[PDB]
DNA sequence: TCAATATCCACCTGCAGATTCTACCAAAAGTGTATTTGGAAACTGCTCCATCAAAAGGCATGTTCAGCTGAATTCAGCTGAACATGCCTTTTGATGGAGCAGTTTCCAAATACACTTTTGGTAGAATCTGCAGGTGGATATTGAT
DNA sequence: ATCAATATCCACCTGCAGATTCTACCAAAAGTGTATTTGGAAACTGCTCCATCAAAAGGCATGTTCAGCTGAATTCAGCTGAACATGCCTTTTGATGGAGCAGTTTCCAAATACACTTTTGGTAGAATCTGCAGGTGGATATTGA
């Protein structure tokens, strides 16, 4: 009867402490942060999916995700989003 | 056997509306606004409650979850952060 | 030792989970190894951008715990994010104070 | 004196007031009935996760607060400082809520 | 080769207006239409099921799905037709 | 002996099915989802085509064109509402001129 | 020498263009504009003839619609002439900016 | 170049819009709006293009574009 | 109300750009067959929804009263509409001539599956701690005179 | 320009919700082979694109007048806002009873997963048509006198 429920809290936090070590998020606020996290994971995952479909392509690779991110995020966030994501990838693929 | 619900649309008082209007940054308010607002509200509500109750019904439940409302607000295009 | 893809990727966000949410999301048959890495990366980034901004709002309020109000203030004061979350509504975030000029006294 | 504030001096005071806050401006209980009253007239014998009624109220006010802004704009664009029904209508009419 | 609903659109046309014909360009719009709606129903259909932690989109989904997409009265027939078209299929 | 005929439909039930599978909507697809969906598509299709056919007759043409589909859509509360965010290319707008603009 | 009151040919043009459905912008100029705008996004691109048509249909349809809302606004301002301030508000409420 | 879009043409659109009298400043204003409309649609299309590693903008690209702008268009790309 | 001027509206007429036809080869779309497994039934476990039960004020409500705002005129400029006048960029119709979208082969490089082996993330239980929610005194802001 | 009548502010001030650490387990996430494919290379075509005429041809660009139309004053009820007085009816903790939402197993009707056949639906040529758009003429509508 553990009836476990996942989340992003743990991480929203880690990152919070990363930019503003001093401050801390409340709760209703953390709640909002998840909504945000999920809302974009889908906006992106979707677009990614839709994109991949139009090309008769079978799988969603980082490429997809990127173009997605590019279609979704506006101007700046888009640029910074990419570099950040590209970078993080090659590091994962650096063995 | 609880009581009959009726005309509750008046719960949305005149004061309650002008407060909303202020946050909306409105200075002067015509006497008609109030009833017009009440109507606009009912319509907004109806539509979201409808769709919501549908997600409920479809899930074979008798209780409306926050999620029901959240999904309802989202397909309507009023995505809400804070509950789902 | 076992390696968290996140660590191998240098991220705080769960890569292992992002990948899983993708598979179970019926977005497509298959999923590349980089997809999660890259997705989580963007998520975590954006998350940081909001928080950095949000947190400040908090400080200017003399408050040390970020609250919805702060999230709103942060989001609505930044074109980028406000554009992004234009159709999004933050519960308990109130409105950005703004009064039409025409409304002020002579 | 007695001391009366010129009509509108307070109204303004009230905008700076509520735009500074974040709580709900419609009363809880009265609102909850409208939900139950409306809900009821669709599917009978329904129940309500408390937080669901909150999602709704958060949603409604946020809607009305926003609608009102556009309205205030229409009034002003009408060389009026008073919002009237015709303002709410053109706003929605343009918003695409209904034609 | 590129599939299309042109055929079925026509077959349906010659049923309500056996007399009326249909412009090529006009036929294009009719396709756009079918795809768009197919898409819409199918979406909410999956979306919905997904909400219920279930792994299969059945007619149940499609129907509710139609009820969330189509206008109160336009939805009825859409619904009746659906149930009908099924029982008939599922019977014989 | 095709489900489409078995279900008594003019639309491609079999195809709708394959499309539901390829489309990536769920893992498994009920056997009635196609037949059903298929029906709904066909039905809306007729509705349009019918009004569009009419649109054309009263116009004295025997062949349905885009405008026709447009005039048929925008004149129906239901449809207009449905495709309120869609533009039928080459369908122009409905003839309507605000009162305030007419001469005295 | 026959002349019509101001606004007569205007109402006529309305009755006339609301009836017709052909595109109202010259294709060449448009196509040129498209390719130009596009060139800032990726160099040496080719356009499907039909891709440009989509763009023009979409574009014109858009403006035609935006003008409608604009009029309502202008009329709301108790005018009969549409000014910039009108297109602006219309857009603004529309949530385009 | 945006000037390619002329007064008469702009005049006609408004006309189909049901507009009677037209202030002179409008034209310039209209060009802007018009230009942004395209900037946004294309910017997106060209992206669907570039993703598909093509060098040609297909009507379908434009469609999938106008579709996420919330400008769904019936008639092209099937 | 005459009176032209032009603008529509009509009932043909027929040449020409597309609609039915026509005549056929492959992917789908059916058919058994052989597993497979989703999730529709019980069956509880126990969470959280619907209901009182009283008091408290915090706020509606209804009423005065009159500031000043929305409506109603009038009235000039000033600005667009309506028109010939004259070029001049579009439009069209046809070619060639490369580009490409699109196909096949081909085939490592990736991705799916399974089999168990860890260990990180999610409850609850304790262990803190930012922050209402209250109180004064500057400090400001209004508004009468 | 002064100054009395109220709002704001802006610290200062502890006792709590609520947060923020503690443990403690499972449900993922990681690992290690195997087996099944993407979908990215290279040539290789055959459609659209593009770049070039050029042919007049309808549109635009352009100044003239002027009719309105818009933006400016100037009143002038009354309809909103500001303030009170008077109570109602939300709030607000505090319990429960017990309608359901969730877990947990079974087990079967309904879905894959496979070849293995038929049937149908996209081409790439034929065989007619529905209208466009050009006539005439009849009014009709728009405008001076
Ligand atoms: Cl990848
Ligand atoms: Cl009104
Ligand atoms: Cl089914
Ligand atoms: Mn920092
Ligand atoms: Mn199972
Ligand atoms: Mn008076
Ligand atoms: Mn005034
Ligand atoms: Mn080549
Ligand atoms: Mn651990
Ligand atoms: Mn305080
Ligand atoms: Mn004059
Ligand atoms: Mn009372
Ligand atoms: Mn029970
Ligand atoms: Mn056949
Ligand atoms: Mn004709």
PDB file of C-alpha atoms in Angstrom, chain B residues 2 5 8-9 12 45 49 53 64 69, chain D residues 28-42 46-49 52-54 56-57 60:
ATOM      1  CA  UNK B   2     -29.788  17.850   0.859  1.00  0.00           C
ATOM      2  CA  UNK B   5     -29.466  24.497  -5.116  1.00  0.00           C
ATOM      3  CA  UNK B   8     -26.250  30.614  -6.507  1.00  0.00           C
ATOM      4  CA  UNK B   9     -24.888  32.595  -9.432  1.00  0.00           C
ATOM      5  CA  UNK B  12     -20.635  36.103  -7.208  1.00  0.00           C
ATOM      6  CA  UNK B  45     -17.687  27.616 -15.742  1.00  0.00           C
ATOM      7  CA  UNK B  49     -17.298  21.739 -15.636  1.00  0.00           C
ATOM      8  CA  UNK B  53     -17.378  15.901 -15.538  1.00  0.00           C
ATOM      9  CA  UNK B  64     -14.471  14.979  -9.918  1.00  0.00           C
ATOM     10  CA  UNK B  69     -10.550  19.987 -13.950  1.00  0.00           C
TER      11      UNK B  69
ATOM     12  CA  UNK D  28     -15.147  30.300  -1.211  1.00  0.00           C
ATOM     13  CA  UNK D  29     -18.436  28.832  -0.060  1.00  0.00           C
ATOM     14  CA  UNK D  30     -20.725  30.907  -2.285  1.00  0.00           C
ATOM     15  CA  UNK D  31     -18.531  29.905  -5.201  1.00  0.00           C
ATOM     16  CA  UNK D  32     -18.480  26.226  -4.303  1.00  0.00           C
ATOM     17  CA  UNK D  33     -22.293  26.111  -4.548  1.00  0.00           C
ATOM     18  CA  UNK D  34     -22.271  27.490  -8.082  1.00  0.00           C
ATOM     19  CA  UNK D  35     -19.908  24.654  -8.943  1.00  0.00           C
ATOM     20  CA  UNK D  36     -22.163  22.090  -7.288  1.00  0.00           C
ATOM     21  CA  UNK D  37     -25.245  23.805  -8.764  1.00  0.00           C
ATOM     22  CA  UNK D  38     -23.821  23.819 -12.264  1.00  0.00           C
ATOM     23  CA  UNK D  39     -22.088  20.450 -11.977  1.00  0.00           C
ATOM     24  CA  UNK D  40     -25.363  19.037 -10.716  1.00  0.00           C
ATOM     25  CA  UNK D  41     -27.368  20.167 -13.723  1.00  0.00           C
ATOM     26  CA  UNK D  42     -25.165  17.911 -15.890  1.00  0.00           C
ATOM     27  CA  UNK D  46     -21.506  13.952  -8.181  1.00  0.00           C
ATOM     28  CA  UNK D  47     -18.733  14.386  -5.625  1.00  0.00           C
ATOM     29  CA  UNK D  48     -15.867  16.882  -5.533  1.00  0.00           C
ATOM     30  CA  UNK D  49     -12.208  16.608  -4.657  1.00  0.00           C
ATOM     31  CA  UNK D  52     -10.897  20.458  -7.752  1.00  0.00           C
ATOM     32  CA  UNK D  53     -13.132  23.304  -6.711  1.00  0.00           C
ATOM     33  CA  UNK D  54      -9.971  25.296  -6.141  1.00  0.00           C
ATOM     34  CA  UNK D  56     -11.925  25.878 -10.864  1.00  0.00           C
ATOM     35  CA  UNK D  57     -11.929  29.088  -8.777  1.00  0.00           C
ATOM     36  CA  UNK D  60     -12.346  31.440 -13.097  1.00  0.00           C
TER      37      UNK D  60
END
